[PDB]
Amino acid sequence: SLALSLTADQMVSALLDAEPPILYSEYDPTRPFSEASMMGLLTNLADRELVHMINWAKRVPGFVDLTLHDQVHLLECAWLEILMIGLVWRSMEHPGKLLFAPNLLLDRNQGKCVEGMVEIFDMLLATSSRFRMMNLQGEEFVCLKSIILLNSGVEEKDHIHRVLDKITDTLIHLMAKAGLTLQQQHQRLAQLLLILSHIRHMSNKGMEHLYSMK
Amino acid sequence: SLALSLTADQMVSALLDAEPPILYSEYDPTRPFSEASMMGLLTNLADRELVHMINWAKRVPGFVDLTLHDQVHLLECAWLEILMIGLVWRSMEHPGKLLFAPNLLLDRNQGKCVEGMVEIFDMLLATSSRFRMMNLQGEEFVCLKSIILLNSGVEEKDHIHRVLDKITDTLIHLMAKAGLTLQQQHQRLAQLLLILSHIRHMSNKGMEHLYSMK
Amino acid sequence: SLALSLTADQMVSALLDAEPPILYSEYDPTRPFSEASMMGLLTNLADRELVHMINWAKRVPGFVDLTLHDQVHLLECAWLEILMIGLVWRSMEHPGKLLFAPNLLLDRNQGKCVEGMVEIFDMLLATSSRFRMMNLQGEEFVCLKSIILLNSGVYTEEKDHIHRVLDKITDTLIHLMAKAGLTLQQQHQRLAQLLLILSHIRHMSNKGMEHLYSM
Amino acid sequence: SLALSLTADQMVSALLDAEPPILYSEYDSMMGLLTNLADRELVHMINWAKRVPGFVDLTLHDQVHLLECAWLEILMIGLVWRSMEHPGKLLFAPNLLLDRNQGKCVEGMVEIFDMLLATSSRFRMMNLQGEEFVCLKSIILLNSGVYTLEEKDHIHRVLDKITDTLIHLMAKAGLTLQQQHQRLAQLLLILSHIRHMSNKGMEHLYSMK
Amino acid sequence: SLALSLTADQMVSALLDAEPPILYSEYDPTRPFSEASMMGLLTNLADRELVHMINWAKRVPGFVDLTLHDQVHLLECAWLEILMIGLVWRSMEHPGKLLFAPNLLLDRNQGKCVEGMVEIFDMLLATSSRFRMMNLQGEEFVCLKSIILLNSGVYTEEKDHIHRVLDKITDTLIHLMAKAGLTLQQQHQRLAQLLLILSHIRHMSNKGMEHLYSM
Amino acid sequence: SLALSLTADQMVSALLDAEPPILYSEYDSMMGLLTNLADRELVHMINWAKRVPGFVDLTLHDQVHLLECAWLEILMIGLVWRSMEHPGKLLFAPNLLLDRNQGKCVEGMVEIFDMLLATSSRFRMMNLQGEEFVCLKSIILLNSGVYTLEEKDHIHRVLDKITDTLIHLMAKAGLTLQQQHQRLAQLLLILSHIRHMSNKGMEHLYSMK
Amino acid sequence: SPGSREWFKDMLS
Amino acid sequence: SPGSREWFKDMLS
Amino acid sequence: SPGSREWFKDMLS
Amino acid sequence: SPGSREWFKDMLS
Amino acid sequence: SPGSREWFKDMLS
Amino acid sequence: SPGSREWFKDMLS
Numbered sequence A, B: 001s002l003a004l005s006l007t008a009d010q011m012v013s014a015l016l017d018a019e020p021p022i023l024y025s026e027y028d029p030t031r032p033f034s035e036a037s038m039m040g041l042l043t044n045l046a047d048r049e050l051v052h053m054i055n056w057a058k059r060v061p062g063f064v065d066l067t068l069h070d071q072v073h074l075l076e077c078a079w080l081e082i083l084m085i086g087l088v089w090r091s092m093e094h095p096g097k098l099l100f101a102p103n104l105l106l107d108r109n110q111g112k113c114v115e116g117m118v119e120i121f122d123m124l125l126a127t128s129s130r131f132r133m134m135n136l137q138g139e140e141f142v143c144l145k146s147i148i149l150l151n152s153g154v155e156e157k158d159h160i161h162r163v164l165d166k167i168t169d170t171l172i173h174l175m176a177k178a179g180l181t182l183q184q185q186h187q188r189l190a191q192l193l194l195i196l197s198h199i200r201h202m203s204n205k206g207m208e209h210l211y212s213m214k
Numbered sequence C, E: 001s002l003a004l005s006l007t008a009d010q011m012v013s014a015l016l017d018a019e020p021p022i023l024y025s026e027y028d029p030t031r032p033f034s035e036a037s038m039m040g041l042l043t044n045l046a047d048r049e050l051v052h053m054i055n056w057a058k059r060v061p062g063f064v065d066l067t068l069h070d071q072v073h074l075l076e077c078a079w080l081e082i083l084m085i086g087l088v089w090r091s092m093e094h095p096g097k098l099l100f101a102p103n104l105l106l107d108r109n110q111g112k113c114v115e116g117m118v119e120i121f122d123m124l125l126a127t128s129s130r131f132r133m134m135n136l137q138g139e140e141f142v143c144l145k146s147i148i149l150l151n152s153g154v155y156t157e158e159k160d161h162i163h164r165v166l167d168k169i170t171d172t173l174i175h176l177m178a179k180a181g182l183t184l185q186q187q188h189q190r191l192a193q194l195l196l197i198l199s200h201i202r203h204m205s206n207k208g209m210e211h212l213y214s215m
Numbered sequence D, F: 001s002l003a004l005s006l007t008a009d010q011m012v013s014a015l016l017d018a019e020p021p022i023l024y025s026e027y028d029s030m031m032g033l034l035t036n037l038a039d040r041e042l043v044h045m046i047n048w049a050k051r052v053p054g055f056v057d058l059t060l061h062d063q064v065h066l067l068e069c070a071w072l073e074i075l076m077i078g079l080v081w082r083s084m085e086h087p088g089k090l091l092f093a094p095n096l097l098l099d100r101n102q103g104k105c106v107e108g109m110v111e112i113f114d115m116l117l118a119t120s121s122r123f124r125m126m127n128l129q130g131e132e133f134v135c136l137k138s139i140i141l142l143n144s145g146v147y148t149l150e151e152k153d154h155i156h157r158v159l160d161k162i163t164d165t166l167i168h169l170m171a172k173a174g175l176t177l178q179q180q181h182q183r184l185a186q187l188l189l190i191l192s193h194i195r196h197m198s199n200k201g202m203e204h205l206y207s208m209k
Numbered sequence G, H, I, J, K, L: 001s002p003g004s005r006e007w008f009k010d011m012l013s
């Protein structure tokens, strides 16, 4: 498979080039939020992002090598983690707030508009602050988001495992090129992947919240 | 803090020495399982393991440096992930089955005794098979379990972060000492930590199942 | 009044900075277009662009000085012309095609999917071709689009203010052309060629509104 | 080619010499009167167009296309020009002057009436000159159907000549360079409104057929 | 019958391999003992050990050859003696203390927490001290514990089978002592010293059962 | 010290010479008769104990402790020994022989009765000898309270002597080394049953006080 | 009819 | 609906 | 329903 | 209860 | 209830 | 009484 022949630079370049567009929100800016209208806005946005997620996923090296069944499974399990890592990324420059869209910036007190949502907001804000504190790079972000897709859900190594190994190589390459020592490289790799556990957690709580309100 | 002065060998030695006892189950072996009795057995076992988890946690380097409040929080969030990683570890030599205790080995078809539990069993079995395929070492296992405790839930680095960096160093040391190349070391570190995301997922589904049956 | 105090370079900057986001479309890409689905897609896009048009209009020098009534009137009159000039601009470097969105590029044959739409497509395509052949610049484009906003409803003292704003945009177009090195004769000839475009844009908007009403 | 060689003064002269006569309203409904007039003006428009420099260089096909596109605009700009000295009224003919409230005679026409009146008011406020008016009418003829390419290149050169001619007229009147550019823009923006009114008129006409 | 065919070394191996797991206790370690909580803790432990005792008994050579009735009878008679000898063994290297579990080590003063229990503690401690001073070996211990199982109820042809099994365990004890280098005189003296221990274990079990009945 | 120097034959002789007489039941309830007998046998037990080699070397305190612990065991082993030739019966005295169904006279005693009968049956099946019996009775005296340390060391040496003496008796009777060890074990395991029966008896006695 | 395509064609040739 | 007088008015104030 | 298995399948095939 | 005759019997068969 | 916050707090302090 | 600690003490000295 071509995906496994990519150099680290070629992997980064492919992942940057696969990025979906940044979506704007539409709303009446002279009308105040309600529970219904805020959840309505976030739902509309997520559903638009899902369409563009499909085009993105097909551009992630290795993804189109999978059967339709495997492609569907990875996306069905990973989509909310993928929305959330994106949100946390674009919120880094806005402490205490979540930048859902360039024209939709919500602070923690606005999260209380939707019953139960503020617990999720606080987890997302902490994650965003952690990425800021770590000085997460865009090249690192795109590697993590593809890891989420491929690690989604639950002979030696299948295709996905081999592609994930290449993304690890690429993360380490990025760190090495930035001048990190080998010890620093392994430490930062660990710190980043541990945050994926927290993103999984936040997705599980989110899916819970979505299923219980449906 | 003393924990941060530990060499990699001293960390491994401390974590091995902290290990709790392997618990046996008690049941009438001439009576067949029921839903009530199997869930009853697993509940009894988990509750016993929780007592010994407290003694274990206090022996994890760094844990007693934390305030009572932080200690309680880490344990409250991590306990089921900790039970599950232990289960998956002791099941490695038993493909298709889960070794809850040395005298309680349950196969997948027995998981169907308890409504909803078989989905969890299948995730646990896959994780155990993954650890087997990776030839997970006991020294690596104890590092991962302590990572779970410390990474539980959701100025540059707090104490927990610094201790987690030392456990990463220790994992890499173990891999280096086994003769892995630097590329192999970083790849295996990533593979292991990605499995922690799946353990988080399984814990979230488990807590769901426990809350819904209560 | 800020608008009349702007130098030509400040006017260009303000108009460039005012630009709305480029919108993407959403659709099932494994599913063929029908008349209903294509018209639904273009309706969806236009309705979304209308929301962002409001934020742009408020950043056009002079617009926010007007009363609410006047703002509503100018936007109500000009909005389809504003959508169409934007469409023509983004299609300029795609001969034969209309770039509704970066992920929605349609040719004239696809226009036949909706009864009566191909005639409108052809007009839009000829206008985009004219733009290309004039080598229309983005700075000129933003001037023209703001002229549409201020002019289309301007007959139907605050009206004297709009006319002084419109005169400033004219000064701005000539400035851009003089800076580009055009002779005095080329500057007035190109000013005329650009403003005559706006009569064709009005025509296409009228034909579009007529088509929208009939369905 | 003969058109492309004319001086600005010769272009003005040719456009003025091409002007059709002013027609009187005649009796065979208000729409009946207007239709009578329009159909008679169309005959004069044919020979006017043929006297607009550059027009007869075009193929028959292109001449038909341009006139088919522009004719109602040409009638309307004429109407607006002759209503200039009649605030609040439209002078369809010397013997047919209507105020706004008379426009309500035909369901639909009074929208069009007010637009024509606002345009005539603009002409008055700008103090539009006859020489400028004839330039604008010839621009309508050559521009309105023009986007739809040598024949169309030639048209663009003639259009550039008429622009040169407008600027010549403004310079001669003593406007500064800035005033000339501003006024050229003001006058060309009127043609957008004339297009609008023609599109609305054509809509009305087609729907009653 | 497998049991009577075992060599002495095979008997030792089988008895060593039969050993039950060492059990841990659970309790709140920030909470002081009361009479109720300590007695509850020891009751809990004993009840759990009883479950594992069944699996051990079935691995004792000869036991499973007996009828259900005989198995029940021997276990019903011997179980507290079996718990107590195990307790004494695991306490051997902890002078003054009883090692109920690796995380439950109690001294005689803690025995006073339960009315009448200190007298039993003292007897168990003296027996553990005797074990230590004899340097009792684990191979000897497993022989003695199995003798308790087979002997305690053995009066209250299948009974001739148990007696031949008991004789084999005696042969096994002497073998272990001869292998250790004891003289013939030291072998019979130590065999007697070990078997006399079992009279004290019976005494402590009887006192324990009496205490359990009274509360 | 005198005890520690005796040969095996001298130990046997001393133990036999120390034997108390067999008492007859006498009349002052079945428990009344047994109590009468027991209390009379206790007096003889005092002088018997003092004639067991090693016993009087111990302090008064230790002598009291040992007898206080062992006395009912000593009575019971005596009872079992004299019932040996009476299958299904207990010969409390020559003039007091009870069968199992007579044991039901005292609520509680018939549990004890059956145990004593099973032990007497075991003695018969082993063909226990008088010389062996006297060794076992002296072991009970010295062992039963012994775990509770020179005085207690001395006791252990005397206990080892009695073991030597049992083995001497078995060797003399022509048992092989293996038979000697097996029989020594069989006889010592009986003392566990004798302890059990004494503990049960003492329970009964204390509860009726 | 006046103003039609055919009419313009006829009038212009 | 989007683009109507009332919609513009609502959105603008 | 966006995000459902069936929706993803439809969109990918 | 654990250790009784019936408990042993139940556990042993 | 083992595993609850309050249970953990009790056991740790 | 016979068999008591005090009785044994008295009989044995």
Ligand SMILES: CC/C(=C(\c1ccc(O)cc1)c1ccc(OCCN(C)C)cc1)c1ccccc1
Residues within 6 Å of the ligand: A042, A043, A045, A046, A047, A049, A083, A084, A086, A087, A100, A117, A120, A121, A124, A206, A207, A209, A210, I001, I002, I003
């Ligand atoms: C945390 C923000 C959020 C959503 C969100 C996150 C990131 C982003 O870029 C956009 C939205 C969210 C909200 C709703 C939602 O609904 C999906 C309904 N479709 C799938 C039918 C998905 C995500 C949300 C999720 C669960 C409950 C409440 C809020």
Ligand SMILES: CC/C(=C(\c1ccc(O)cc1)c1ccc(OCCN(C)C)cc1)c1ccccc1
Residues within 6 Å of the ligand: B042, B043, B045, B046, B047, B049, B083, B084, B086, B087, B100, B117, B120, B121, B124, B206, B207, B209, B210, K001, K002, K003
């Ligand atoms: C997956 C096995 C399991 C439990 C388990 C896992 C590992 C282990 O070593 C022991 C048990 C499990 C079952 C019940 C349980 O209850 C806790 C109740 N207490 C906390 C009040 C905890 C874990 C379980 C968890 C949730 C639902 C159904 C089953």
Ligand SMILES: CC/C(=C(\c1ccc(O)cc1)c1ccc(OCCN(C)C)cc1)c1ccccc1
Residues within 6 Å of the ligand: C042, C043, C044, C045, C046, C047, C049, C083, C084, C086, C087, C100, C117, C120, C121, C208, C209, C211, C212, H001, H002, H003
């Ligand atoms: C020519 C493309 C087009 C529209 C369009 C133009 C530019 C652009 O950027 C996006 C769309 C179009 C389609 C529908 C529409 O109105 C929807 C009704 N809303 C306003 C209530 C407006 C423009 C259209 C207009 C009329 C008929 C058929 C198609």
Ligand SMILES: CC/C(=C(\c1ccc(O)cc1)c1ccc(OCCN(C)C)cc1)c1ccccc1
Residues within 6 Å of the ligand: D034, D035, D037, D038, D039, D041, D075, D076, D078, D079, D092, D109, D112, D116, D200, D201, D202, D204, D205, G001, G002, G003
């Ligand atoms: C604005 C006045 C007008 C006409 C008009 C304009 C200027 C002028 O000088 C003379 C008349 C108008 C009315 C009717 C008309 O019909 C043409 C029918 N022929 C073409 C078969 C044309 C113009 C009119 C046009 C459309 C609807 C209603 C009224």
Ligand SMILES: CC/C(=C(\c1ccc(O)cc1)c1ccc(OCCN(C)C)cc1)c1ccccc1
Residues within 6 Å of the ligand: E042, E043, E044, E045, E046, E047, E049, E083, E084, E086, E087, E100, E117, E120, E121, E208, E209, E211, E212, J001, J002, J003
């Ligand atoms: C001496 C320790 C002890 C028990 C014990 C001994 C050894 C061992 O390994 C564990 C415990 C003891 C306590 C209770 C018990 O029975 C509980 C009742 N169940 C059997 C129904 C048995 C032994 C005990 C016995 C009687 C009274 C007081 C305490």
Ligand SMILES: CC/C(=C(\c1ccc(O)cc1)c1ccc(OCCN(C)C)cc1)c1ccccc1
Residues within 6 Å of the ligand: F034, F035, F037, F038, F039, F041, F075, F076, F078, F079, F092, F109, F112, F116, F200, F201, F202, F204, F205, L001, L002, L003
């Ligand atoms: C087994 C016969 C027996 C006694 C007995 C045994 C052997 C023997 O040679 C003579 C009697 C027995 C009965 C009573 C008794 O009381 C002593 C009261 N004195 C000590 C104040 C002692 C033994 C007995 C003991 C306890 C309960 C019931 C019966």
Ligand SMILES: [Ca+2]
Residues within 6 Å of the ligand: A030, A031, H009, H010, H011, H012, H013
């Ligand atoms: Ca509003």
Ligand SMILES: [Ca+2]
Residues within 6 Å of the ligand: C030, C031, I009, I010, I011, I012, I013
């Ligand atoms: Ca499809």
Ligand SMILES: [Ca+2]
Residues within 6 Å of the ligand: B030, B031, J009, J010, J011, J012, J013
């Ligand atoms: Ca049973």
Ligand SMILES: [Ca+2]
Residues within 6 Å of the ligand: E030, E031, K009, K010, K011, K012, K013
């Ligand atoms: Ca506490």
